[PDB]
Nucleic acid binder design. Sequence first.
RNA 1: ACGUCGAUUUAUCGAGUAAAAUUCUGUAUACAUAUUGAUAAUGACAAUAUGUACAUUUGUCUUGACUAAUUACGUGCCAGCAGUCGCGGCAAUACGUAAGAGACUAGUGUUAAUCAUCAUAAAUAGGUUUAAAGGGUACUCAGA
RNA 2: AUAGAUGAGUUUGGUGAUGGCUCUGAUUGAACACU
Lengths: 128, 75, 467, 160, 190, 116, 50, 53
Amino acid sequence: ATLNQVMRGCRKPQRARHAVSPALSSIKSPALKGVCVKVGITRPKKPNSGERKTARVRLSTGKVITAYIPGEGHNISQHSVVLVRGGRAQDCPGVRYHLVRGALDLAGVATRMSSRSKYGTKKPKKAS
Amino acid sequence: AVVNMDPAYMAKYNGSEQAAGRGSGLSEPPAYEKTADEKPAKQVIANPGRKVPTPYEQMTFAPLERRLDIAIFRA
Amino acid sequence: ISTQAAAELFKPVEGDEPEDVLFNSLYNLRSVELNRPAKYNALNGSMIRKIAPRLLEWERSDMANVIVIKGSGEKAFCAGGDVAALAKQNAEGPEGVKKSVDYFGLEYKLNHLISTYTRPYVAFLDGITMGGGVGLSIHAPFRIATERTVFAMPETKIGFFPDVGASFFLPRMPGQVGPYLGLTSALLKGVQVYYAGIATHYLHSSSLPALESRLAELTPRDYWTIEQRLSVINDTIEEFSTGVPYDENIEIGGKIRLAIDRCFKYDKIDEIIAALKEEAAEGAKGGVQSWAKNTLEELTQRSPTSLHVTLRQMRLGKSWGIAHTFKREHQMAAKFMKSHDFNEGVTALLIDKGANGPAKWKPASLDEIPPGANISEDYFRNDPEVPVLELLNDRSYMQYPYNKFGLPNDYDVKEAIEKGNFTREKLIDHFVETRRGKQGVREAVSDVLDRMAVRSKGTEHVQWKKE
Amino acid sequence: GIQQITNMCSHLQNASRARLGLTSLPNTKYNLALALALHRAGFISSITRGGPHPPTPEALMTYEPEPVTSANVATRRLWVGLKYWNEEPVLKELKPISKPSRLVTASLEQLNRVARGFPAGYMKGLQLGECLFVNTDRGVLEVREAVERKVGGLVLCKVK
Amino acid sequence: DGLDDKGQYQELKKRTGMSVRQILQLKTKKLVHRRVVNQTRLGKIASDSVMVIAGNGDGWLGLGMAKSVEASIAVEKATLLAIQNMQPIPRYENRTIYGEVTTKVSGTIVRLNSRPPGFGLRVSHRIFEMCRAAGIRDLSAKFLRSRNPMNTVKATYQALLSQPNPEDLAIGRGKKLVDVRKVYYGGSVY
Amino acid sequence: QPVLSEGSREIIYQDVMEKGLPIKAVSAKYNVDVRRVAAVIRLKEIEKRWIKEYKPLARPYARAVMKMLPQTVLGGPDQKPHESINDVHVHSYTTQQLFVPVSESREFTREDAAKA
Amino acid sequence: GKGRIFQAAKVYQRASEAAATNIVSGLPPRNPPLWLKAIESIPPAEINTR
Amino acid sequence: ARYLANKRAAQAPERLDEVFTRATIRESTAKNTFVPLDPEAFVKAEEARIKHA
RNA sequence: ACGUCGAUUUAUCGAGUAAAAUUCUGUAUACAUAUUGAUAAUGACAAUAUGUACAUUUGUCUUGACUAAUUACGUGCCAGCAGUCGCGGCAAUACGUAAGAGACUAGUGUUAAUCAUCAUAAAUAGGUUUAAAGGGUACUCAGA
RNA sequence: AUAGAUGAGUUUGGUGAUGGCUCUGAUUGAACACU
Ligand SMILES: [K+]
Ligand SMILES: [Mg+2]
Ligand SMILES: [Mg+2]
Ligand SMILES: [Mg+2]
Ligand SMILES: [Mg+2]
Ligand SMILES: [Mg+2]
Ligand SMILES: [Mg+2]
Ligand SMILES: [Mg+2]
Ligand SMILES: [Mg+2]
Ligand SMILES: [Mg+2]
Ligand SMILES: [Mg+2]
Ligand SMILES: [Mg+2]
Ligand SMILES: [Mg+2]
Ligand SMILES: [Mg+2]
Ligand SMILES: [Mg+2]
């Protein structure tokens, strides 16, 4: 572009890219609290197969998002106050969030021995 | 790093000979010819030991040698 | 003489032209073009002061590997110096005479630098070469003659004597051709300069531009000796040789060459002319009646003082050094400014352009000079008034270090005969091989074997006539 | 104007790229300025102005051009002698800097930095063989000449 | 001495003409490893294209490229093909290149820069191997357009051979090109 | 690298203190750096204080350790210089690769290189 | 680009560098080709210059 | 001081070694930039008027 | 303790100089004393110096490639893992356990955000035949 | 202020380009999980 075309404002910002977790990225928050509206199952897309445990959550801001429940086995149901954090299920459309397992009402995997920090599992305290 | 420079060379020469030729210095015959001739060509004018390389790569952890606890160990 | 001492010693004196000389610098080539075609590129104080600083500068650089000097026009290379100007200054009292001695000082300082130069020096003799032009070439190892070359030393005709060191080059010429070319001031044209020995090579004038482009491509190594550098340039010049003419024969050869050695071997002009009279006399066996007669008509038309002084130094110059020559020539040429012949001949031939009749020397003719006279004795006594010439360097030599690139003369043929068992025909071939078939070797060697070679033992071997 | 120097930079490249012995350029006060700088720097062989046909190569230097009056000024032209060595042109690149759309002026404090391989402003450092020509009050000099004369000016082109 | 019990170096022992023990002292390193595939009348035929660099560490670098269905034979081919293609690379003070070089190989442009002593090999992962094998110790690099692994190495190899010769630039211009660092210290401070 | 012998340290100390010679002369006489000559005197002056204060030196540790390191006895038997006393610091400006184009016959000196 | 890179004019410059040093660092360079010294002082002519 | 030094370098003589080692550029090409009017303009105009007629 | 533990080739491969044990120090801190913050006088509170005394936790992520680090068993497109490419359909180095290994450490990971990566809006410094992108046309005011 | 400019994974049967995305580096008045 000629120096004149630049003087008149030809350089404009690039089109924005969507965030993985818009509800959190929009307001610059790392996590939000929401009331579980529904705990169901989502099926992956073409390549993957299985039943992914998801949860329809209504955030404190008002948005109704779908979060993924990590780990094996959960104890949340209708009207459960759960903590939502960023993330995304790469094979489940609309599942663009995760749920912290050491959160308010969602409990951590009790039979977890590896990566306990990721699933909110206190140490067994075998000797102690 | 530092560079050794003796005063004998400076007193005699002022670095002009180093620019002789095309700026790099007077060229010398190849090695496969010096071994053929009987008499050796005159030695080049320069500082003593001015062709050996310096080990810059081996001074990576020099800053640690400045610590007080390390200096006590090296002594 | 550093870059500063040279610039202060060769200041641009008022009156010097800006474009007297045209310098050029190619890859490995450094050219010098005397730009004064209106006056046949005649040297002068202005030009000498522009060439000496450059030659000294190019001597300190290893990138300049070949030096070339040439003329501007298509008629002359360097047609003598401003001799007509020195005549006027000489007529302005002693103050004006010292100016002439100063000019000859600069000229001798330059010719000496060229004789002891530390780099290959080439001279394109593409035109008439006389006076100062003979100083820039005879001392160089390479002297390229062409069809337009006209060599001569018209110095004894103007009352003056020989020049910047021809008194060192002429004595050690083959036989007595040196003094002959000086005294008589003969006129050599074209290839005859190549055969005589003045020129080392002979190329056509149209192939000189292509020769320069080649001399620039040559890139010698810094560890090469000067002998290697001159050999690489000698073989490069011989590539542009179109061959000497097929009809033109050696002018000074055979009979005429023998007469020169039989009439110019004495130490007195009275005997030389006496010998020539015998040759001119009908019935002589020499066969140079026509030549001897023409030579006499020219010897009786020159200043008798210069002839005595000229022939005097031809015998002395055979022992002087290259540097001692200039010092003696300066003290010698300094006394010629005070003489009556020089100031008269120059005015009567150049300023007057032959008007008012021919020149009138102080002695009417050699006959006036009695036998006991030794006029050739005052011009060889340096006076304390004239300071000794201070050359730019201390380099010197008795014989030329590299002057064996021309045709083989008697000295070379002699060395071969005295170190071998070659025959009449087998000896000529020995030179055509060593010289890589240089043009004119078969005709030059054959001539030498026709004057100083006797068929004593038949076709088995050949010996010299002197014995 | 600067448009002439830009055309001169491109043509000299195209001529060297085509391996031509001679090259013609329009006879202007500005072109002669840069040409003398290239010659003084050692990139071109000679500069002589002449008519629409090149002078006699045999007498290039000795060429005596006729006076330039209004009767022939429209036909004059600058004839430059290109250089080629080691199967490679000596004037390979002539990348310009100051174009008609923008004139780049450099200071002495910046040329001193560009002369040692360090960028400064809209220029870049000079490496081995490179060369930068600057148009200043003392003529079209080289960055190392302008640094010695302690002056800045207008940057014309970079030569490799 | 049993160093080559397979016979792969014997054919190379004649071209370059040096003992097998001396061939093992050369710095070799596989740079590229592509899995190419040619579709034929009998189905796909997967080959292994590899590029290997060989250098003694004192100013010699060779680039070789070969392919075969076996990954083992493809590396031995390029290794032998790279040791015989060794060429002398000029290096300033045996530590860096002369000036700057910019080469282009089919959309992969490489710009190498000379850097002062003690700068190090602040270059990419493939250039580090070539410089470390050729004997260079201070350099900077930058891929301008593309980063194709192969053309990246081809362009860098052609750049180490296309360095500006400071002496050819002097004779061409008729002007000295003085090594300021040499005159200052009185010699080549390696 | 060799270390200054015990008896050698005193020679340097006595020359600078008793004979009052300039440190530069002593540095160039024995080829010892001026920075080391000044440290030998500083450390030696602390010994005089200890000997003056009747303090016990680490003699058992000094003799045994000096036998593990190479030494250079100064004076008569000076086989090699202790170290280089003319080492110059490599300035960052003087590390650049510069090829200045100059005349073919120029006398480029160290002064001209410094200005470049 | 149907042509090929012909370096016939630089056979000396190339051969002179490859014969200056030895590939096996620590040994003297072997003798050069027999033709390296024959054309040492006979450089090629300038080609491709209109 | 900074003004004299800056002015002394801009009006300094060219290096001698760089004056003796530079090809000669004829003054007719490096200094004759002025283009005067054709002295024979009045004559050519009159002659061209006859031929055009 | 010429013992113990895990592998296995009962002697190989490790835990392992690791531990215990022995010889020293007195670090954070505790206490005492003194000075000082302030001087005309006024000290809420604490710092600094010196003396003496004490040897006090491990935690966490990763381990298919990018990316430093391995096997066994269980599971069987299920359960789950995942920043990207992807892994899992009965002999899975990718899931979950056990052991080993790699690394940071009173911190370690994860989420969110910003810069750089990105010449990825290119003034420095881009590009538009076939890949995003030449206006249907050129007379022309402004403007370059 | 003269040392300061660096890449990696991923489209294709495959090669070379184009053009995104992601990792590699630094950080927070950060939150959470295990400590
Ligand atoms: K001529
Ligand atoms: Mg996906
Ligand atoms: Mg584990
Ligand atoms: Mg995991
Ligand atoms: Mg304490
Ligand atoms: Mg109060
Ligand atoms: Mg790995
Ligand atoms: Mg894929
Ligand atoms: Mg696992
Ligand atoms: Mg801390
Ligand atoms: Mg269109
Ligand atoms: Mg429209
Ligand atoms: Mg349209
Ligand atoms: Mg296809
Ligand atoms: Mg791209």
